[PDB]
């Protein structure tokens, strides 16, 4: 039950390519609890045992959808800061070889936007751009695979682009997310 408000005409244009995403439970870190027909995930303190083969040792989970040409848009609601929203090629590593728990945008195969307490970090290839923080927790990802552009949006209180990456994407892209303990992410459907 999203609160009614008149949809911004720019946001309505983005929705012309809206995609309804679901999480992939095989990928999910063993501490992650999925609900709402796999539209919602929460990082819990208590583990669910060994999640199994293919599960992220990082604090991550990916979606069951991938994208390769065309133009695609979706929205996600975060319960709080300290989440990362991104896309990756299929080769993104699942293991935690070191102290870091988030590898989204830490190599050439993924791109991500991490929401922090008082800033944003736009990650690719192990480099982050530090951007001004936002208070809104409703975030959009616009993936134009015709032009090779990925743009992150904040949708509340206005529709505002946050950062755009350009790339010549050469494999299908799968949405992928990082969550600190206690955080919930909800894949919004339209």
N, CA, C and O of each residue as an XYZ file, in Angstrom:
760
protein
N       0.822     -1.201      0.000
C       0.000      0.000      0.000
C       0.861      1.257      0.000
O       1.057      1.876      1.046
N       1.377      1.638     -1.172
C       2.043      2.941     -1.290
C       1.052      4.079     -1.105
O      -0.080      4.022     -1.585
N       1.497      5.114     -0.399
C       0.642      6.278     -0.144
C       0.324      6.983     -1.462
O       1.247      7.302     -2.211
N      -0.945      7.236     -1.769
C      -1.275      7.952     -3.007
C      -0.638      9.337     -3.042
O      -0.593     10.049     -2.040
N      -0.150      9.693     -4.224
C       0.349     11.007     -4.592
C       0.351     11.028     -6.111
O       0.450      9.977     -6.745
N       0.243     12.214     -6.703
C       0.281     12.280     -8.162
C       1.696     11.977     -8.653
O       2.660     12.633     -8.258
N       1.801     10.971     -9.520
C       3.093     10.538    -10.033
C       3.660     11.637    -10.922
O       3.041     12.036    -11.909
N       4.849     12.124    -10.558
C       5.720     12.970    -11.356
C       5.739     12.525    -12.814
O       5.970     11.344    -13.074
N       5.506     13.422    -13.782
C       5.514     12.993    -15.194
C       6.841     12.413    -15.667
O       6.843     11.536    -16.531
N       7.975     12.874    -15.129
C       9.242     12.231    -15.471
C       9.283     10.806    -14.939
O       9.756      9.901    -15.626
N       8.791     10.598    -13.718
C       8.753      9.247    -13.180
C       7.814      8.381    -14.006
O       8.096      7.205    -14.235
N       6.699      8.953    -14.455
C       5.775      8.164    -15.267
C       6.433      7.747    -16.577
O       6.174      6.652    -17.075
N       7.288      8.611    -17.144
C       8.008      8.226    -18.356
C       8.964      7.070    -18.082
O       9.081      6.158    -18.901
N       9.651      7.099    -16.936
C      10.536      5.991    -16.570
C       9.768      4.679    -16.472
O      10.270      3.630    -16.874
N       8.542      4.739    -15.932
C       7.723      3.554    -15.741
C       7.310      2.910    -17.052
O       6.812      1.785    -17.038
N       7.496      3.579    -18.190
C       7.120      2.931    -19.440
C       7.930      1.661    -19.677
O       7.516      0.809    -20.463
N       9.079      1.519    -19.013
C       9.897      0.314    -19.091
C       9.933     -0.458    -17.768
O      10.911     -1.150    -17.489
N       8.881     -0.348    -16.952
C       8.917     -0.925    -15.608
C       9.031     -2.448    -15.650
O       8.343     -3.107    -16.430
N       9.905     -3.003    -14.805
C      10.075     -4.452    -14.661
C       9.853     -4.884    -13.214
O      10.405     -4.277    -12.297
N       9.042     -5.935    -13.001
C       8.785     -6.456    -11.651
C       9.833     -7.526    -11.302
O       9.831     -8.610    -11.886
N      10.718     -7.220    -10.357
C      11.841     -8.082    -10.005
C      11.513     -8.963     -8.804
O      10.657     -8.629     -7.985
N      12.214    -10.102     -8.715
C      12.151    -10.974     -7.538
C      13.561    -11.418     -7.166
O      14.426    -11.547     -8.031
N      13.788    -11.652     -5.873
C      15.095    -12.135     -5.432
C      15.286    -13.608     -5.796
O      14.322    -14.364     -5.915
N      16.552    -13.997     -5.969
C      16.933    -15.376     -6.231
C      17.326    -16.006     -4.908
O      18.392    -15.682     -4.383
N      16.507    -16.899     -4.338
C      16.837    -17.481     -3.016
C      18.086    -18.343     -2.999
O      18.704    -18.484     -1.944
N      18.489    -18.930     -4.131
C      19.698    -19.747     -4.137
C      20.930    -18.873     -3.893
O      21.893    -19.320     -3.270
N      20.904    -17.636     -4.380
C      22.018    -16.701     -4.239
C      22.112    -16.069     -2.853
O      23.174    -15.573     -2.476
N      21.025    -16.078     -2.091
C      20.911    -15.200     -0.942
C      21.872    -15.616      0.168
O      22.053    -16.803      0.438
N      22.486    -14.619      0.807
C      23.344    -14.916      1.947
C      22.514    -15.609      3.031
O      21.334    -15.310      3.212
N      23.156    -16.542      3.749
C      22.440    -17.435      4.661
C      21.737    -16.689      5.786
O      20.822    -17.234      6.402
N      22.144    -15.454      6.066
C      21.503    -14.622      7.074
C      20.292    -13.871      6.536
O      19.638    -13.149      7.288
N      19.978    -14.023      5.256
C      18.912    -13.262      4.622
C      17.604    -14.036      4.668
O      17.562    -15.225      4.353
N      16.535    -13.350      5.065
C      15.193    -13.924      5.142
C      14.340    -13.292      4.054
O      14.159    -12.074      4.031
N      13.816    -14.115      3.152
C      13.004    -13.646      2.036
C      11.518    -13.772      2.357
O      11.098    -14.732      3.004
N      10.723    -12.800      1.904
C       9.285    -12.822      2.147
C       8.561    -12.178      0.969
O       9.185    -11.732      0.006
N       7.236    -12.138      1.063
C       6.397    -11.483      0.065
C       6.679    -12.011     -1.338
O       6.945    -11.246     -2.265
N       6.616    -13.334     -1.474
C       6.822    -13.981     -2.769
C       8.157    -13.555     -3.373
O       8.266    -13.324     -4.577
N       9.171    -13.454     -2.510
C      10.554    -13.136     -2.868
C      10.699    -11.727     -3.430
O      11.626    -11.458     -4.194
N       9.788    -10.822     -3.055
C       9.952     -9.406     -3.364
C      10.658     -8.627     -2.265
O      11.025     -7.472     -2.481
N      10.860     -9.223     -1.095
C      11.418     -8.510      0.044
C      12.472     -9.382      0.713
O      12.326    -10.603      0.776
N      13.535     -8.754      1.213
C      14.622     -9.454      1.894
C      15.075     -8.624      3.098
O      15.107     -7.395      3.034
N      15.426     -9.307      4.199
C      15.956     -8.664      5.393
C      17.197     -9.414      5.853
O      17.196    -10.643      5.919
N      18.257     -8.674      6.172
C      19.468     -9.260      6.753
C      19.268     -9.400      8.263
O      19.243     -8.405      8.987
N      19.127    -10.639      8.731
C      18.891    -10.950     10.134
C      20.193    -11.307     10.849
O      21.167    -11.727     10.223
N      20.192    -11.132     12.174
C      21.370    -11.501     12.955
C      21.570    -13.015     12.981
O      22.699    -13.490     12.863
N      20.486    -13.775     13.134
C      20.575    -15.227     13.220
C      20.708    -15.831     11.828
O      19.985    -15.449     10.907
N      21.633    -16.776     11.678
C      21.839    -17.408     10.383
C      20.806    -18.509     10.147
O      20.206    -19.030     11.087
N      20.612    -18.851      8.871
C      19.747    -19.956      8.451
C      20.553    -21.208      8.125
O      20.213    -21.936      7.192
N      21.615    -21.467      8.882
C      22.537    -22.528      8.562
C      23.395    -22.131      7.382
O      23.408    -20.963      6.994
N      24.119    -23.087      6.798
C      24.762    -22.826      5.501
C      23.695    -22.691      4.427
O      22.915    -23.615      4.193
N      23.665    -21.528      3.771
C      22.654    -21.284      2.757
C      22.721    -22.271      1.611
O      21.696    -22.599      1.015
N      23.921    -22.752      1.291
C      24.101    -23.748      0.263
C      25.074    -23.296     -0.804
O      25.626    -22.198     -0.722
N      25.291    -24.139     -1.813
C      26.159    -23.736     -2.927
C      25.542    -22.588     -3.711
O      24.325    -22.521     -3.885
N      26.400    -21.684     -4.182
C      25.966    -20.517     -4.912
C      25.530    -19.356     -4.051
O      25.290    -18.268     -4.576
N      25.417    -19.544     -2.742
C      24.979    -18.461     -1.886
C      26.135    -17.496     -1.670
O      27.282    -17.909     -1.500
N      25.817    -16.206     -1.677
C      26.815    -15.182     -1.380
C      27.324    -15.341      0.049
O      26.537    -15.421      0.992
N      28.656    -15.386      0.201
C      29.278    -15.229      1.514
C      29.328    -13.759      1.917
O      29.217    -13.429      3.098
N      29.495    -12.883      0.934
C      29.228    -11.472      1.094
C      27.795    -11.273      1.570
O      26.974    -12.188      1.490
N      27.500    -10.079      2.063
C      26.147     -9.784      2.542
C      25.289     -9.328      1.361
O      24.859     -8.176      1.294
N      25.050    -10.263      0.426
C      24.462     -9.919     -0.870
C      23.412    -10.936     -1.314
O      23.350    -12.063     -0.823
N      22.590    -10.490     -2.264
C      21.590    -11.340     -2.899
C      21.337    -10.731     -4.268
O      21.386     -9.511     -4.425
N      21.066    -11.579     -5.267
C      20.768    -11.100     -6.613
C      19.323    -11.438     -6.983
O      18.639    -12.166     -6.263
N      18.872    -10.901     -8.112
C      17.504    -11.140     -8.555
C      17.472    -12.289     -9.548
O      18.502    -12.715    -10.069
N      16.265    -12.779     -9.796
C      16.060    -13.855    -10.749
C      15.941    -13.361    -12.178
O      15.732    -14.173    -13.081
N      16.066    -12.065    -12.421
C      15.938    -11.508    -13.765
C      17.288    -10.991    -14.248
O      18.098    -10.518    -13.450
N      17.529    -11.080    -15.562
C      18.722    -10.502    -16.192
C      18.318     -9.697    -17.427
O      17.241     -9.910    -17.983
N      19.188     -8.766    -17.861
C      18.819     -7.852    -18.955
C      19.922     -7.742    -20.001
O      21.095     -7.645    -19.639
N      19.576     -7.753    -21.304
C      20.698     -7.729    -22.253
C      20.600     -6.731    -23.410
O      21.629     -6.281    -23.915
N      19.413     -6.386    -23.830
C      19.261     -5.267    -24.734
C      18.061     -4.520    -24.205
O      17.579     -4.816    -23.112
N      17.568     -3.550    -24.968
C      16.336     -2.892    -24.593
C      16.540     -1.832    -23.522
O      17.618     -1.251    -23.395
N      15.483     -1.593    -22.755
C      15.438     -0.494    -21.797
C      14.553     -0.958    -20.653
O      13.445     -1.442    -20.886
N      15.032     -0.817    -19.403
C      14.431     -1.458    -18.238
C      14.523     -0.517    -17.042
O      15.521      0.186    -16.880
N      13.483     -0.503    -16.202
C      13.442      0.400    -15.053
C      12.743     -0.307    -13.904
O      11.770     -1.031    -14.115
N      13.237     -0.099    -12.685
C      12.555     -0.628    -11.512
C      12.873      0.249    -10.313
O      13.813      1.043    -10.324
N      12.055      0.080     -9.272
C      12.183      0.836     -8.036
C      12.296     -0.111     -6.851
O      11.719     -1.199     -6.843
N      13.051      0.326     -5.851
C      13.360     -0.448     -4.652
C      13.172      0.467     -3.451
O      13.547      1.638     -3.505
N      12.596     -0.048     -2.368
C      12.516      0.709     -1.120
C      13.470      0.129     -0.079
O      13.444     -1.071      0.192
N      14.310      0.984      0.503
C      15.226      0.586      1.566
C      14.660      0.992      2.924
O      14.133      2.094      3.071
N      14.767      0.104      3.922
C      14.279      0.469      5.259
C      15.152      1.523      5.924
O      14.710      2.178      6.867
N      16.384      1.700      5.450
C      17.397      2.498      6.141
C      18.586      2.634      5.200
O      18.620      2.021      4.133
N      19.567      3.448      5.609
C      20.822      3.529      4.875
C      21.647      2.267      5.113
O      21.250      1.371      5.857
N      22.810      2.224      4.456
C      23.740      1.090      4.473
C      23.175     -0.081      3.663
O      23.085     -1.210      4.146
N      22.800      0.223      2.424
C      22.479     -0.770      1.412
C      23.188     -0.365      0.128
O      23.534      0.801     -0.060
N      23.402     -1.347     -0.761
C      23.985     -1.085     -2.074
C      23.075     -1.691     -3.127
O      22.629     -2.830     -2.993
N      22.799     -0.924     -4.177
C      21.958     -1.351     -5.293
C      22.812     -1.353     -6.548
O      23.492     -0.368     -6.835
N      22.787     -2.453     -7.302
C      23.680     -2.528     -8.441
C      23.249     -3.555     -9.467
O      22.198     -4.184     -9.347
N      24.093     -3.708    -10.485
C      23.958     -4.767    -11.481
C      25.336     -5.370    -11.725
O      26.354     -4.706    -11.532
N      25.364     -6.637    -12.150
C      26.630     -7.321    -12.402
C      26.512     -8.262    -13.589
O      25.425     -8.722    -13.939
N      27.668     -8.536    -14.203
C      27.813     -9.636    -15.129
C      27.746    -10.937    -14.340
O      27.848    -10.914    -13.113
N      27.577    -12.076    -15.019
C      27.501    -13.363    -14.303
C      28.741    -13.738    -13.488
O      28.634    -14.599    -12.614
N      29.907    -13.141    -13.725
C      31.119    -13.620    -13.063
C      31.336    -13.034    -11.671
O      32.376    -13.291    -11.065
N      30.397    -12.261    -11.146
C      30.620    -11.601     -9.865
C      30.927    -12.638     -8.790
O      30.133    -13.559     -8.601
N      32.050    -12.524     -8.079
C      32.385    -13.536     -7.071
C      31.398    -13.564     -5.908
O      30.867    -12.534     -5.493
N      31.167    -14.772     -5.395
C      30.301    -14.993     -4.245
C      31.067    -15.050     -2.923
O      30.470    -14.844     -1.867
N      32.369    -15.323     -2.956
C      33.136    -15.540     -1.739
C      33.609    -14.228     -1.137
O      33.802    -13.232     -1.834
N      33.788    -14.256      0.173
C      34.408    -13.186      0.931
C      35.853    -13.590      1.202
O      36.130    -14.278      2.185
N      36.775    -13.169      0.341
C      38.173    -13.511      0.558
C      38.850    -12.617      1.590
O      39.891    -12.993      2.130
N      38.287    -11.442      1.880
C      38.937    -10.527      2.790
C      38.016     -9.911      3.823
O      36.982    -10.484      4.166
N      38.396     -8.728      4.323
C      37.553     -8.055      5.315
C      36.311     -7.412      4.728
O      35.350     -7.180      5.462
N      36.288     -7.111      3.428
C      35.148     -6.419      2.838
C      33.972     -7.381      2.686
O      34.158     -8.559      2.383
N      32.758     -6.866      2.900
C      31.530     -7.659      2.809
C      30.676     -7.283      1.611
O      29.646     -7.912      1.372
N      31.080     -6.270      0.851
C      30.343     -5.764     -0.310
C      31.338     -5.715     -1.457
O      32.365     -5.045     -1.351
N      31.054     -6.414     -2.558
C      31.943     -6.312     -3.710
C      31.259     -5.688     -4.925
O      31.795     -5.765     -6.031
N      30.088     -5.072     -4.745
C      29.341     -4.506     -5.866
C      30.031     -3.223     -6.328
O      30.194     -2.285     -5.548
N      30.435     -3.186     -7.600
C      31.214     -2.062     -8.097
C      32.664     -2.068     -7.680
O      33.369     -1.087     -7.917
N      33.137     -3.142     -7.065
C      34.536     -3.213     -6.690
C      35.415     -3.862     -7.754
O      36.584     -4.146     -7.492
N      34.878     -4.100     -8.943
C      35.633     -4.632    -10.050
C      34.980     -4.219    -11.360
O      33.971     -3.514    -11.355
N      35.547     -4.651    -12.480
C      35.019     -4.222    -13.777
C      33.693     -4.887    -14.142
O      33.099     -4.517    -15.154
N      33.205     -5.854    -13.360
C      32.017     -6.620    -13.779
C      30.727     -6.154    -13.119
O      29.681     -6.768    -13.326
N      30.773     -5.083    -12.330
C      29.578     -4.632    -11.642
C      29.622     -3.130    -11.443
O      30.677     -2.500    -11.519
N      28.446     -2.575    -11.188
C      28.254     -1.142    -11.000
C      27.236     -0.992     -9.878
O      26.260     -1.741     -9.840
N      27.434     -0.046     -8.963
C      26.523      0.040     -7.832
C      26.467      1.425     -7.224
O      27.333      2.266     -7.465
N      25.422      1.647     -6.422
C      25.225      2.890     -5.682
C      24.999      2.494     -4.238
O      23.998      1.851     -3.922
N      25.920      2.871     -3.352
C      25.754      2.549     -1.942
C      25.204      3.776     -1.208
O      25.744      4.875     -1.334
N      24.133      3.581     -0.444
C      23.508      4.652      0.313
C      24.089      4.619      1.720
O      23.959      3.618      2.425
N      24.724      5.699      2.125
C      25.324      5.760      3.458
C      24.568      6.758      4.315
O      23.638      7.417      3.851
N      24.986      6.863      5.590
C      24.320      7.751      6.537
C      24.188      9.156      5.979
O      23.114      9.755      6.044
N      25.282      9.686      5.426
C      25.338     11.102      5.084
C      25.959     11.333      3.711
O      26.459     12.426      3.445
N      25.938     10.334      2.835
C      26.492     10.463      1.496
C      26.015      9.282      0.661
O      25.409      8.340      1.172
N      26.302      9.354     -0.634
C      26.155      8.233     -1.559
C      27.527      7.907     -2.136
O      28.375      8.791     -2.262
N      27.749      6.636     -2.489
C      28.966      6.194     -3.166
C      28.580      5.499     -4.463
O      27.874      4.491     -4.440
N      29.041      6.033     -5.602
C      28.810      5.413     -6.918
C      30.056      4.608     -7.276
O      31.112      5.178     -7.550
N      29.928      3.271     -7.271
C      31.042      2.317     -7.360
C      31.142      1.678     -8.744
O      30.143      1.202     -9.284
N      32.348      1.668     -9.317
C      32.661      0.782    -10.441
C      34.167      0.581    -10.483
O      34.930      1.528    -10.295
N      34.598     -0.657    -10.729
C      36.019     -0.954    -10.937
C      36.858     -0.620     -9.693
O      38.031     -0.269     -9.820
N      36.274     -0.726     -8.505
C      37.022     -0.456     -7.257
C      37.161      1.013     -6.909
O      37.836      1.352     -5.937
N      36.538      1.897     -7.682
C      36.537      3.337     -7.457
C      35.138      3.815     -7.096
O      34.164      3.459     -7.760
N      35.038      4.622     -6.044
C      33.782      5.275     -5.691
C      33.828      6.780     -5.915
O      34.817      7.435     -5.586
N      32.745      7.326     -6.481
C      32.495      8.768     -6.407
C      31.635      9.055     -5.181
O      30.577      8.451     -5.009
N      32.085      9.976     -4.329
C      31.318     10.362     -3.143
C      30.362     11.485     -3.509
O      30.790     12.542     -3.974
N      29.070     11.262     -3.303
C      28.029     12.202     -3.688
C      27.294     12.687     -2.452
O      27.308     12.008     -1.425
N      26.646     13.854     -2.525
C      25.841     14.328     -1.391
C      24.797     13.302     -0.973
O      24.226     12.602     -1.809
N      24.557     13.224      0.334
C      23.573     12.287      0.840
C      22.159     12.672      0.451
O      21.876     13.836      0.166
N      21.266     11.679      0.442
C      19.838     11.931      0.268
C      19.059     11.306      1.420
O      19.453     10.276      1.967
N      17.944     11.947      1.782
C      17.054     11.420      2.803
C      16.040     10.419      2.251
O      15.558      9.570      3.001
N      15.703     10.494      0.966
C      14.707      9.585      0.421
C      15.205      8.153      0.394
O      16.386      7.895      0.162
N      14.283      7.217      0.635
C      14.608      5.796      0.639
C      13.924      5.025     -0.487
O      13.956      3.795     -0.487
N      13.309      5.713     -1.443
C      12.697      5.068     -2.604
C      13.601      5.357     -3.793
O      13.727      6.505     -4.218
N      14.230      4.313     -4.332
C      15.310      4.481     -5.283
C      14.946      3.800     -6.589
O      14.330      2.734     -6.590
N      15.329      4.414     -7.703
C      15.065      3.853     -9.019
C      16.355      3.551     -9.757
O      17.371      4.216     -9.557
N      16.303      2.531    -10.621
C      17.399      2.183    -11.519
C      16.862      2.100    -12.938
O      15.979      1.294    -13.235
N      17.405      2.946    -13.816
C      17.023      3.037    -15.231
C      18.182      2.521    -16.072
O      19.247      3.136    -16.116
N      17.969      1.386    -16.743
C      19.007      0.653    -17.464
C      18.679      0.725    -18.947
O      17.822     -0.017    -19.427
N      19.351      1.612    -19.680
C      19.092      1.790    -21.118
C      20.184      1.037    -21.862
O      21.280      1.557    -22.074
N      19.874     -0.198    -22.255
C      20.912     -1.020    -22.850
C      21.053     -0.760    -24.337
O      21.956     -1.306    -24.972
N      20.179      0.062    -24.910
C      20.426      0.554    -26.260
C      21.583      1.544    -26.266
O      22.469      1.460    -27.117
N      21.580      2.481    -25.320
C      22.601      3.516    -25.259
C      23.734      3.170    -24.300
O      24.767      3.840    -24.311
N      23.568      2.143    -23.473
C      24.590      1.775    -22.516
C      24.659      2.669    -21.298
O      25.749      2.929    -20.790
N      23.521      3.148    -20.815
C      23.460      4.079    -19.692
C      22.713      3.459    -18.522
O      21.648      2.868    -18.699
N      23.275      3.595    -17.330
C      22.621      3.166    -16.104
C      22.520      4.381    -15.199
O      23.538      4.954    -14.812
N      21.298      4.782    -14.858
C      21.084      5.964    -14.029
C      20.320      5.570    -12.782
O      19.299      4.887    -12.857
N      20.821      6.004    -11.631
C      20.147      5.841    -10.356
C      19.343      7.089    -10.024
O      19.786      8.212    -10.268
N      18.157      6.880     -9.464
C      17.246      7.956     -9.089
C      16.874      7.877     -7.616
O      16.842      6.799     -7.024
N      16.594      9.037     -7.040
C      15.783      9.123     -5.836
C      14.397      9.569     -6.269
O      14.270     10.416     -7.153
N      13.354      9.010     -5.657
C      12.029      9.310     -6.155
C      11.228     10.135     -5.153
O      10.171     10.659     -5.504
N      11.704     10.263     -3.913
C      11.008     11.041     -2.897
C      12.010     11.992     -2.253
O      13.102     11.562     -1.881
N      11.669     13.280     -2.109
C      10.378     13.879     -2.476
C      10.172     14.226     -3.960
O       9.027     14.374     -4.388
N      11.234     14.360     -4.750
C      11.089     14.559     -6.184
C      11.811     13.445     -6.910
O      12.583     12.688     -6.322
N      11.541     13.363     -8.211
C      12.318     12.520     -9.103
C      13.631     13.242     -9.405
O      13.625     14.297    -10.038
N      14.757     12.680     -8.955
C      16.055     13.337     -9.101
C      17.117     12.317     -9.481
O      17.354     11.376     -8.723
N      17.766     12.475    -10.635
C      18.869     11.575    -10.975
C      20.030     11.816    -10.023
O      20.343     12.954     -9.676
N      20.658     10.732     -9.611
C      21.742     10.752     -8.634
C      23.109     10.542     -9.264
O      24.079     11.190     -8.873
N      23.193      9.639    -10.238
C      24.439      9.308    -10.919
C      24.139      8.452    -12.140
O      23.252      7.600    -12.108
N      24.888      8.685    -13.223
C      24.811      7.879    -14.436
C      26.173      7.281    -14.764
O      27.169      8.000    -14.846
N      26.215      5.962    -14.953
C      27.343      5.267    -15.565
C      27.066      5.015    -17.038
O      25.925      4.772    -17.433
N      28.122      5.076    -17.851
C      28.060      4.635    -19.239
C      28.996      3.456    -19.448
O      30.094      3.425    -18.892
N      28.567      2.483    -20.249
C      29.400      1.317    -20.517
C      28.899      0.652    -21.783
O      27.739      0.811    -22.164
N      29.782     -0.097    -22.435
C      29.372     -0.957    -23.549
C      29.145     -2.356    -22.987
O      30.007     -3.229    -23.089
N      27.969     -2.552    -22.392
C      27.672     -3.799    -21.689
C      27.735     -4.984    -22.650
O      27.088     -4.967    -23.698
N      28.514     -6.017    -22.298
C      28.778     -7.119    -23.228
C      28.358     -8.495    -22.718
O      28.701     -9.505    -23.331
N      27.628     -8.553    -21.616
C      27.009     -9.744    -21.061
C      25.700     -9.292    -20.443
O      25.528     -8.102    -20.179
N      24.762    -10.219    -20.202
C      23.545     -9.871    -19.451
C      23.861     -9.360    -18.055
O      24.814     -9.807    -17.417
N      23.046     -8.414    -17.588
C      23.213     -7.791    -16.272
C      22.130     -8.283    -15.326
O      20.946     -8.278    -15.664
N      22.543     -8.707    -14.139
C      21.615     -9.158    -13.103
C      21.623     -8.170    -11.947
O      22.701     -7.861    -11.439
N      20.470     -7.654    -11.501
C      20.461     -6.800    -10.309
C      21.039     -7.535     -9.105
O      20.809     -8.731     -8.926
N      21.797     -6.801     -8.278
C      22.458     -7.394     -7.123
C      22.539     -6.326     -6.031
O      22.698     -5.140     -6.320
N      22.428     -6.760     -4.778
C      22.234     -5.861     -3.641
C      23.094     -6.287     -2.455
O      23.356     -7.475     -2.262
N      23.533     -5.302     -1.658
C      24.245     -5.520     -0.406
C      23.444     -4.880      0.722
O      22.886     -3.795      0.558
N      23.391     -5.558      1.869
C      22.594     -5.113      3.010
C      23.380     -5.280      4.297
O      23.857     -6.373      4.603
N      23.516     -4.197      5.052
C      23.993     -4.294      6.423
C      22.992     -5.087      7.267
O      21.827     -5.223      6.892
N      23.450     -5.609      8.408
C      22.530     -6.313      9.299
C      21.404     -5.383      9.739
O      21.638     -4.215     10.049
N      20.171     -5.914      9.764
C      19.000     -5.162     10.181
C      18.244     -4.468      9.055
O      17.144     -3.964      9.283
N      18.799     -4.427      7.851
C      18.179     -3.682      6.769
C      17.210     -4.577      6.014
O      17.413     -5.787      5.907
N      16.151     -3.962      5.490
C      15.201     -4.606      4.589
C      15.238     -3.891      3.245
O      15.283     -2.662      3.197
N      15.218     -4.657      2.143
C      14.989     -4.108      0.806
C      13.730     -4.731      0.220
O      13.517     -5.938      0.332
N      12.891     -3.899     -0.408
C      11.648     -4.336     -1.047
C      11.683     -3.962     -2.528
O      11.833     -2.789     -2.870
N      11.544     -4.960     -3.409
C      11.456     -4.729     -4.850
C      10.029     -4.296     -5.172
O       9.093     -5.077     -4.999
N       9.853     -3.061     -5.637
C       8.512     -2.521     -5.822
C       7.954     -3.027     -7.142
O       8.673     -3.103     -8.139
N       6.670     -3.375     -7.148
C       6.011     -3.825     -8.368
C       4.986     -2.802     -8.851
O       4.357     -2.111     -8.050
N       4.826     -2.717    -10.181
C       3.810     -1.840    -10.787
C       3.033     -2.583    -11.859
O       2.137     -2.012    -12.480
